Every structure is written in C-alpha cells, then in structure tokens.
Amino acid sequence: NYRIEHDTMGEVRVPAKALWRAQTQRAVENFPISGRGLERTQIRALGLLKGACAQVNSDLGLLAPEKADAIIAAAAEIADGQHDDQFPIDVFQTGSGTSSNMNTNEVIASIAAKGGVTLHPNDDVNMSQSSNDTFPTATHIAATEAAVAHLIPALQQLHDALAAKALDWHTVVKSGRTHLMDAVPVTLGQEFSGYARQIEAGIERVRACLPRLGELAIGGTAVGTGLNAPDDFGVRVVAVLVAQTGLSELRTAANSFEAQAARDGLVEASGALRTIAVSLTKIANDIRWMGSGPLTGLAEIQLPDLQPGSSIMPGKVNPVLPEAVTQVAAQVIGNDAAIAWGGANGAFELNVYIPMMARNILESFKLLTNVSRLFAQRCIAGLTANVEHLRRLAESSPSIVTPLNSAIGYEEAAAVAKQALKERKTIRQTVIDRGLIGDRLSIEDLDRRLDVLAMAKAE
C-alpha cells in the first residue's frame, strides 16, 4: 500500500497510488493544521507557470526538447484540473510555499514517468527557478486572473442590474431619510443610481491596483538577484504567460528585491476588495430595510421569494441574499486584516507569509465574484416597488410644508404639518380641510407647491 522515496534528508514512505513523492509526504506529516490545501485557481497558476518555464528553458537550449515537451504536457493536465487530488499539503506550510512548489515538481515528474520520460523534479522541472520567485509568481497570476476574468465582469453585471432599476424607478417618488428620520423627497431611482456608482467606483478601484497586482517575481530566483537563471528568464516567461492566457496585466516586477521581500501588491488589492465589501454592506442593508415588514417594517419594496423563511413561523420570507452579501463582506474585512498582518512581517530578502496571504486574497476574490452575480440575478433584477405607498408617505410628510410658507406663513404651515400627522392625511388634503384655499392660495397653486416629484429634482 506504500512505496519508498528519497531526498537530501533520507528515506520517506509514500502512498503507492499518490503522484507526489518524498518532499510532499514530509510536508503532509509536518503540517496537519487546517486540513485544507491549495485551491483550484492556485493549482491552475502553478501548472501554467511550470509549463511556461519549461518552454523558456527549451527555447534557450538549457533543457532537452523531449524533457521540455513532457513538462509542458504534464503541466497542462495540472492547469486543467485533472490532478487536484495530488496537492495534499496544508495552506499553513513553510512561508515561501516551497512545499507546494516541490509538490508541483514531483507530480509533473510522476506524470511524465508514466509516458516513459525521466525528469528530475529539481534539476529539470525547477530549472532556472526558486520557490522564492515561483510561489509568489503563481499567487500573483491567480490574483490577477481572479480580478480581470472573474471579479470585474461579476461587478459589471451587478452595476448593470442596479443601473437598470435606477432607470425603471426614475419617477418613483419617496420620502428621503437622514439619521433614520423623515426628510425631503427623493426617488427610488436616485438611491439606486447611488448604489450603481458605488459598484462602478469599485471596478475603478480594482483596475487602479492592476499595475502592481500583475507584477511577477519570476527570474529573481533565491534572493532577487537572478543568480542561477538566464538574465532574460523573467521577461521570456512573462511573454509566454501573456501569449498563452491573454492576461496582458501580467508583467515583470519594477524591482526584483521588492517583488520577493514584500507582498505589498496583495495588501493593496485587498484594500480595494475591502472597500467593495464596505459598499456592498450599505447597498444590502438599505435593500433589506426597504423590504422589511410586510406590516411592522418600511415595506418600500418587495424582494423575490427564494425559500421558506422560518422552521417555526409559517408564511414568513426573509431577505436571504442581502444576508449572504453582508456575511461575505464581514469575511472580506477579516481576510483583509490577515493579509495586512502577513504583509508587514517580511524579513530581509523574503516575506514568508505567502501561502496564508494567497489563501485569503483568493477567497475574497471568489466570495465577492459569486455573491455579486447571485445578488444581481436572484435579488436586484426581480425587485418590485410599492409605488402608491411610497408616493403617499412623501405627499404626507411634514418636510414638504416649507414651499407653503410664502402663501400661508410658517406658523400656519407648522399647524398643517401637525394636523396631517394626527389625522394620517396628505399635506394637500390637510390644507383643503383647514379651509386655506382662496384668493391667497388656489388649488392649482397648491399642487404646484406640493409637487413631490419636482422637489426630488429628477434628471
């Protein structure tokens, strides 16, 4: 049921059917901490990087073409997700990600062996590389792809759903709320245009971090000097990665020492994700408050029904998607604090918090991507406004008596506001009931002064 493998420290017993070897098995026994390993996106990025490195080593005549072809074929299988069960090392491993780097090299060597090609995991699969430049490179590839190919399109879909509702509800007049108290009129469309701008500003924030998030350490080797790698190894690997993936945001780092001694690009990108979580909290909280009730809440809008709300209270339906959004936002805030903590504590030539920082930034990208699409499609798209109820409260608000001052005086306007609340009537009906229609104020003049939609000043 087991086999014997070797490294510079001795013999190691490895499960017979595992594609990994001695160094991965040592890491399995050294780090049983979370029971969770690398994600699909991380394994994909490691496979992409190893294939591109083999291509460049072959191009420079440093690696035999048959060996390079075997790495490229094996690495493509890893990048496609055919061997995700061959990456058992915990996230909480050696801080440079050496163990997961060794894990990729050993799995490539075992795949190639099945095709009759002998590869040395270090001498062939890790040629011109170090763990110190490859694991952060794979991390930054995965984070750049998560930003460009998944998060930005998901945020754009949420922006478009919010902007469509802002247009549908352009004339849906309602009463404004400041400090949670009755204020002057607004439209439901104006509030949703505000939410749309928060998401649009979110996309701008992600785009602004891309020139530094896309910076790759590849070619810097052990300390950033590029020792034991060709001088143009970095630019050549990046050129191959851009041609294969289409991820134009990928680039060699401006400074090779900053690219390995620190992970400031991840701290920066997390700050953008954290700001999006802050924006999403406001939007989701306002939406669940607008849908509150039906009889003891605000009852401004109706959220689409997604599932029975209670195991005990029958008929009750809860805002389950705003709840999922606010919980994701809390997770992003938490992950952000762990990333910054890891980011600050590098030492000299290497920051050794990379696997922990990678786990947190990639999870925040994933959670925000998936919850934004669900929020857009299963909540925002199907919202219904209680138009008549919203207009009635705006027309019954004591805040709209101020344009009556030049006709009846502020004293009489305050008396109108007081009687309207007491009798639960509109300001218009109260002005009529108090016998104020005459030479001083006509009904046409009253409807002009109390035009709540005009007070909202919609475009």
Enzyme catalytic residues = 179, 310
* 353/119 Cα distance (integer angstroms): 30
Rule CB under 8 A: is residue 88 a binding residue for a copy of itself?
Answer: no
Least Å from the CB of residue 77 to a copy of itself: 21
> Would the annotation count 159 as a binding residue?
no
Say how far residue 448 (Cα) sits from the centre of its chain: 47
Cα diameter, the chain: 105
Among 57, 58, 245, 351, binds a copy of itself (CB under 8 A): 351
Rule CB under 8 A: is residue 179 a binding residue for a copy of itself?
Answer: yes
List helix spans (H) across 350-399.
354-375, 387-395
Q: Which of residues 37-76 bind a copy of itself (CB under 8 A)?
A: none
Least Å from the CB of residue 111 to a copy of itself: 18
Count of residues making up the chain: 459
What does residue 174 show for φ and ψ, rounded to 5 degrees?
-150, 170
Q: Which stretch in 33-41, 53-61, 137-145, 232-240 sits in contact with a copy of itself by CB under 8 A?
A: 33-41
Tokens representing residue 240 in the block: 């191959």
Q: Which of residues 216-255 bind a copy of itself (CB under 8 A)?
A: 221-228, 254-255
Beta bridge partners of 6: 11
Three-state DSSP class for 257? coil
Q: Quick check: 247 and 148 in contact, CB under 8 A? A: yes
**Residue indicated by tokens 């109260």:** 430
Q: Using alpha carbons, list the distances in angstroms from residue 130 to 21, 430, 435.
A: 19, 80, 88
Among 5, 18, 20, 31, binds a copy of itself (CB under 8 A): 31
> Would the annotation count 311 as a binding residue?
yes
Least Å from the CB of residue 265 to a copy of itself: 8
> Would the annotation count 103 as a binding residue?
no
Q: Quick check: 132 and 350 in contact, CB under 8 A? A: yes
Least Å from the CB of residue 247 to a copy of itself: 20
Choose between 244 and 258: whose C-beta lies nearer to a copy of itself. 258
CB atoms within 10 A of CB 66: 11
Say how far residue 188 (Cα) sits from the centre of its chain: 26
Q: Which stretch in 73-81, 139-147, 153-161, 266-274 sits in contact with a copy of itself by CB under 8 A?
A: 266-274
Rule CB under 8 A: is residue 4 a binding residue for a copy of itself?
Answer: no
Say how far residue 454 (Cα) sits from the centre of its chain: 39
> Would the annotation count 370 as a binding residue?
no
Q: Which of residues 304-343 bind a copy of itself (CB under 8 A)?
A: 305-321, 323-324, 326-331, 333-343
> Would the annotation count 98 as a binding residue?
yes
Tokens representing residue 75 in the block: 């690495």
> Would the annotation count 120 as a binding residue?
yes
Rule CB under 8 A: is residue 190 a binding residue for a copy of itself?
Answer: yes
Q: Which of residues 390-449 bind a copy of itself (CB under 8 A)?
A: 393, 396-399, 401-403, 405-406, 409-411, 413-418, 421
Q: At what angle do helices 354-375 and 152-168 cross, to 10 degrees?
A: 30
Choose between 244 and 331: whose C-beta lies nearer to a copy of itself. 331
> Would the annotation count 96 as a binding residue?
yes
Enumerate the known binding-site residues for substrate: 96-98, 120-123, 130-132, 178, 311, 316-318
